Amino acid sequence: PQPLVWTQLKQTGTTQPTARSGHTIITVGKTHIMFGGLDNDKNNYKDGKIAPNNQVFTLKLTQNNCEWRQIACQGDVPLPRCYHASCAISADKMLVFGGSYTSNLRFNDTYILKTTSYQWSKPAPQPRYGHSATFFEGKVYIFGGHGGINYQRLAFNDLYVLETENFEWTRLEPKGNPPDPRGGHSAAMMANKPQLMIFGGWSFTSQYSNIMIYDIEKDEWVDPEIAHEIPKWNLSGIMAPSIPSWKYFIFGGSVGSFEEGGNRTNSRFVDDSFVLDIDTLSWSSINLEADETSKAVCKPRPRESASIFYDSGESRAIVFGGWANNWLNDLWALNVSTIT
């Protein structure tokens, strides 16, 4: 029962990433870019393959009205169409790695898209999907995930860094032992200190929601706990970090908690959103009851894509497409209130 402002936005144009999820909304300055995901075309196997089409989509938002247009692409564009891929930016160059191909679990190598040129390139590392990634603007970090190519790997607790200037992968030795093999996890950075954050993830018929942080400067792990209305056991949760106050924003995702002995299967999804203030390690349900109704809030859903975005003059969360049990095309925006 805390302030929030939900808005279901309006879309325009024939090309819209409808019936999509597991795609990536990347923003740098004004560069709000769509890529990957998954759809269904129901015409043939070839169309099932182009369902997660490499079509990069661009958006022009006007007072919650959105005009969608596909962008052009050149260079090395892999033929099959990907999902679960991880991406990064270096100020004009989208860096893509990982993901898989639905038909044969073909994983993607390192690609880039020079945005100013609107072209691709193949710069070149356990071949993996479902991992999490982030970049310290000199190093691209990958951690956890799901292998499986040619050797049917398991979940992973390893992590690598990729040098952009030296074009080489490097293995970070885990000093702290606790990090367990995970995938489909949240991995972002704190800004109070320069380190990563590992918020749980998936493992062997078990979600996870613990917290691990990686001081690069020490090249090691620290384990902080949480309290205050935590999302107990949730994956595929919608993510938005707020750098001003170091506040993680989670929404929905795959949730549900049983013992390992149980089938447990009952990953009912949630529509609630929380905020983890890192400085206090304090979760806080941003749920509201002072607004019109609860029905005007979006429905429980994992696998959506999210980003921070300024609509009508206020930074706010964006939720697009997704798994509200299967197929979403809806675009949602939770206006971040005065608390910033």
């Binding site: 019936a19 998954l38 269904n40 099932g48 369902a51 999902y83 639905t102 038909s103 679990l105 499986g148 040619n150 050797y151 049917q152 398991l154 998936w202 493992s203 062997f204 018929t205 078990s206 390992e260 089938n263 447990r264 299967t265 009952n266 990953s267 009912r268 696998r303 798994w323 509200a324 049990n325 299967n326 197929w327």
Partner: protein, 306 residues
């Protein structure tokens, strides 16, 4: 051309071991014209051993891939015709328990197949070949379970349009009652109650989730502590997605029933207000009783409309 189909470097090492060796002295055996069958017997003994290995490999491969078809045929024949309204549904629960019993029987078979491949690999560094083998075995198992729940979810997908080749409400389906409760439209099987699982009762969607558990609970290899719930979660939504037509068709019938509920509200009936205030309003009007008699005639025509 028998070790490359399985693509096992273990049996490739085995073919390296195997060879017909025939000594320099045997280059001087056939010119005797006496009994000279020793090199053939030796190379042939080698051959025999390899052929029993070949038969074991073929049998293991065959049974591994055949045990998968049983899952799919069972789940198909089971979910072809559920016909399960609430108490036949209570019984289809036990029938799906028989499905899970077929699954657990093929799990008792999982044990025997990992044993038969213990014999098949016939290695000392067993675990290294165990990787090359169980990797592929597990991925094929995932495929099988995926196709299984595919056929099930598509069964119940094929229940929406009563217009394509025939109607669809051909059999006794779940029955839903319409009530006037607290002076308002009320579906005891609310559209939302047969829909979203709430505190009062659960329905079709929770049934789908429970069928999902019934399917994805086999004892995987590689330390066996987890289950293969999640390669399912991946595959369905990677290509197959049947839950999607599920959601959209359920919401479609939902909107149809909401439109019908609005239609029910359209009886032009008043807000079920107390008779005293309307009586008092007409009293303030002070009309002849014949106006109230015409009002009662309208009420009788309303009963006739009901």
């Amino acid at each position: 051309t028998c070790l490359l189909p399985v693509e096992e470097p273990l049996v490739k090492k085995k073919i390296q071991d195997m060879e017909e060796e025939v000594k320099p002295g045997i280059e001087e055996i056939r010119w005797k014209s006496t009994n000279i069958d020793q090199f053939i017997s030796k190379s042939k003994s080698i051959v025999d051993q390899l052929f029993e290995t070949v038969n074991k490999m073929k049998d293991s491969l065959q049974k591994i891939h055949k045990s998968l078809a049983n899952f799919n045929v069972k789940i198909i024949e089971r979910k072809n015709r559920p016909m399960s309204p609430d108490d036949y549904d209570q019984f289809l629960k036990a029938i799906f328990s028989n499905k899970l019993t077929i699954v657990k029987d093929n799990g008792n078979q999982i044990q025997k197949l990992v044993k038969e491949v213990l014999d098949a690999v016939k290695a000392d560094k067993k675990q290294n070949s165990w990787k090359n083998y169980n990797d592929y075995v597990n991925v094929i198992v995932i495929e099988g379970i995926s196709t299984a729940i595919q056929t099930a979810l598509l069964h119940l997908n094929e229940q929406i349009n009563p217009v394509f080749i025939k109607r669809n409400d051909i059999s006794p389906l779940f029955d839903i009652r319409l009530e006037l409760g607290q002076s308002g439209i009320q579906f005891d099987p609310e559209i939302g109650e047969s829909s979203n699982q709430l505190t009062v009762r659960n329905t079709i969607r929770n049934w789908i989730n429970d069928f999902f558990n019934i399917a994805g609970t086999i004892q995987r290899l590689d330390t066996t502590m987890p289950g293969d719930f999640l390669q399912e979660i991946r595959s369905f939504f990677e290509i197959k997605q049947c839950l999607a037509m599920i959601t959209q068709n359920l919401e479609w019938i939902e909107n149809e029933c909401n439109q019908f509920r609005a239609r029910f509200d359209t009886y032009s009936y008043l807000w079920t207000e107390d008779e005293n205030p309307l009586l008092k309003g007409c009293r303030a009007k002070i009309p002849n009783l014949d106006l109230f008699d015409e009002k009662i005639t309208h009420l009788k025509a309303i009963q006739q409309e009901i």
